[PDB]
């Protein structure tokens, strides 16, 4: 049989918007996959989410030192750590590696698919567009979602289904905050 | 909640099976560090963090002790409601475009993990490859499930085929996800 | 140089 398990989670979540203008703290108390109590800094008091929570929220709100300490965590946890994100995480820039590779052996007037692989970049803001002879392809472009590699790098693959005619030039445009200019990578049909 | 940056300054985990727990911090979905609860050490996930950032691992041991206490109170209140096993979804891909001869890394994404107990191994030509294998901790999701990423630094060649083996309570048989050049 | 902190969980009152 499957072993029985009881899971408990506590998530201290900070939501930053517009630099340091808007900061929000939401601590979450989760039993298995049921969030039964939370503290929202925009509300100011603990609240029960499910009928499993009222005994917990009523007790934490009835403790002055606990309620004060949690309200101060907007400053002691969220705003304090965000200053260290500005010095480390938020200034991390990893330039993307852009390569084009056909899915099958290239043949003139034969169906093929070009994959523009944009690998190992950070942050996540990326913009990729396919072009054929200075004309943006917008019909045979199939893009995968943002692939998170888990090692603080991202990856995305944009695939273009096309038919290589004689003389065609296919360019993959990539824009990224780590780049001073938009970059391109060219791919030509072999003669 | 709409925001430019979301940080989990405290993903705290504790489960009765084991028992076992986990403490880590996340920023925009990426794990900054995890605290080894046994060795009482903070393990940052980037060289940049190890130079300018510091976290006392005793803070993690203090929090996990609260979760163990809270779990016992809520088990009684919930009339002993066990966790439901979720079926994990596995995806295998490479970190870079695979070219025969150039060293690459194989990535195995095991998503929708609950409860947070899973086995992730690698099989090269059937044989269980052990060297050059690493994985991340359990990363949090908004629906309070988890996902875990395992890595395999390999050398592409038409001689070798690879599989990611995943064992979970929600899976009747161990799930195998193949990857070939 | 300065140690960072996380959120502190409140303790259930089932003493």
């Amino acid at each position, epitope marked *: 049989d499957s072993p029985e398990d009881f899971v408990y989670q506590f998530k201290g979540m900070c939501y930053f918007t517009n630099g340091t203008e808007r900061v929000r703290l939401v601590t979450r108390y989760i039993y298995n996959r049921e969030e039964y109590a939370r503290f929202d800094s925009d509300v100011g008091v603990y609240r029960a989410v499910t009928p499993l929570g009222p005994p917990a929220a009523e007790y934490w709100n009835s403790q002055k030192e606990v309620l004060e300490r949690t309200r101060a965590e907007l*400053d002691t946890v969220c705003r*304090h750590n965000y200053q260290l994100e500005l010095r480390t995480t938020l200034q991390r820039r990893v330039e993307p590696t852009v390569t084009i590779s056909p899915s099958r052996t290239e043949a003139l007037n034969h169906h093929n698919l070009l994959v523009c692989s944009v690998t190992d970049f950070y942050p996540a803001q990326i913009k990729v567009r396919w072009f054929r002879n200075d004309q943006e392809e917008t019909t045979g472009v199939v893009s995968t979602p943002l692939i998170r590699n888990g090692d603080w790098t991202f990856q995305i693959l944009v695939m273009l289904e096309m038919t290589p005619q004689r003389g065609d030039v296919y360019t993959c445009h990539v824009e990224h905050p780590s780049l001073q200019n938009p970059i391109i990578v060219e791919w030509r049909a072999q003669s | 909640i709409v925001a430019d940056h979301v940080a989990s300054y405290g993903v705290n985990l504790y489960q009765s099976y084991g028992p076992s727990g986990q403490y880590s911090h996340e920023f925009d979905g990426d794990e900054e560090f995890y605290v080894d609860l046994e060795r009482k050490e903070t393990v940052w996930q980037l060289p940049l963090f190890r130079r300018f950032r510091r976290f006392d691992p005793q803070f993690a*041991l203090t929090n996990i*002790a609260v979760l163990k*206490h809270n779990l016992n109170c809520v088990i009684k209140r919930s009339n002993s409601t066990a966790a439901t096993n979720e079926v994990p979804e596995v995806t295998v891909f490479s970190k870079s475009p695979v070219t025969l001869g150039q060293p690459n890394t194989l990535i195995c994404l095991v998503d929708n993990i609950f409860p947070p107990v899973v086995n992730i191994t690698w099989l090269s030509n059937g044989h269980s490859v052990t060297e050059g294998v690493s994985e991340t901790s359990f990363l949090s999701k908004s629906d309070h499930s988890f996902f875990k990423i395992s890595y395999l630094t390999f050398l592409p060649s038409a001689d070798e085929i690879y599989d990611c083996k995943v064992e979970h309570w929600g899976l009747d048989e161990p799930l195998l996800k193949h990857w070939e050049p | 140089g300065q140690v960072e902190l996380g959120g502190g969980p409140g303790a259930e009152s089932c*003493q």
Partner: T-cell receptor, first 109, second 110 residues
């Protein structure tokens, strides 16, 4: 550890006593705590704070805007306030308390 | 406030002491300290939910325990002359302000 206090200080009875404390290495996540210990007694919690000002029935605490210094304010200094006052910092993270040298306050009648 | 018994204690070398502490009603965390004129306020251990959460740097002969009602007891084996101090007990809701008790004035003699 992170706090500097004068070793001794006198004040007039009835007037206000302003005990200073210096803590330039303080972190944005560390509170300023004040304890006092009368002879042959245990430490007595007085007041704590994070930023700016705080007041309770025992004393007042003023923290500078840059938070590099604080000052405990005893409103009506009585003869029973003659004790050793410890200015300490604490994360309020369930960790231990560390006491410094403290200030030896003497209330002169 | 926090209560501690006994308030004064005389012992000889090699004996053992058991000190009691009653935290403030509703508090769940109990910390023990040793206060000497020479070493100052030294931390022993902190207990929460009948379990030791934090641990100082004192040897194994300094042991503690916490009961279900959050009351705590502390034990010292093979008493040495250097153990003469005021053994203080601090009480807290969980991680917040620690309130001290009167302490046990322990004197170890030959």
């Amino acid at each position: 550890m992170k706090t500097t206090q004068p070793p001794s200080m006198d004040c007039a009875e009835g007037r206000a006593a302003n005990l200073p404390c210096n803590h330039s290495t303080i972190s944005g996540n560390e509170y300023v705590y004040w304890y006092r210990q009368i002879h042959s007694q245990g430490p007595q919690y007085i007041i704590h704070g994070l930023k700016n000002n705080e007041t309770n029935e025992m004393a007042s605490l003023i923290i500078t805007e840059d938070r590099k210094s604080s000052t405990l304010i005893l409103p009506h200094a009585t003869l029973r306030d003659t004790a050793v006052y410890y200015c300490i910092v604490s994360h309020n993270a369930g960790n231990m308390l560390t006491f410094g040298g403290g200030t030896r306050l003497m209330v002169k009648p | 406030g926090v209560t501690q018994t006994p308030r004064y204690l005389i012992k000889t070398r090699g004996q053992q002491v058991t000190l009691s502490c009653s935290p403030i009603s509703g508090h769940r965390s109990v910390s023990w300290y040793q206060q000497t004129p020479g070493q100052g306020l030294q931390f022993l251990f902190e207990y929460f939910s009948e379990t030791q959460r934090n641990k100082g740097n004192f040897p194994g002969r300094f042991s503690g325990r916490q009961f279900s009602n959050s009351r705590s007891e502390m034990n010292v084996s093979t008493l040495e002359l250097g153990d003469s101090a005021l053994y203080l007990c601090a009480s807290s809701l969980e991680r917040e302000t620690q309130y001290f008790g009167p302490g046990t004035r322990l004197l170890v003699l030959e």
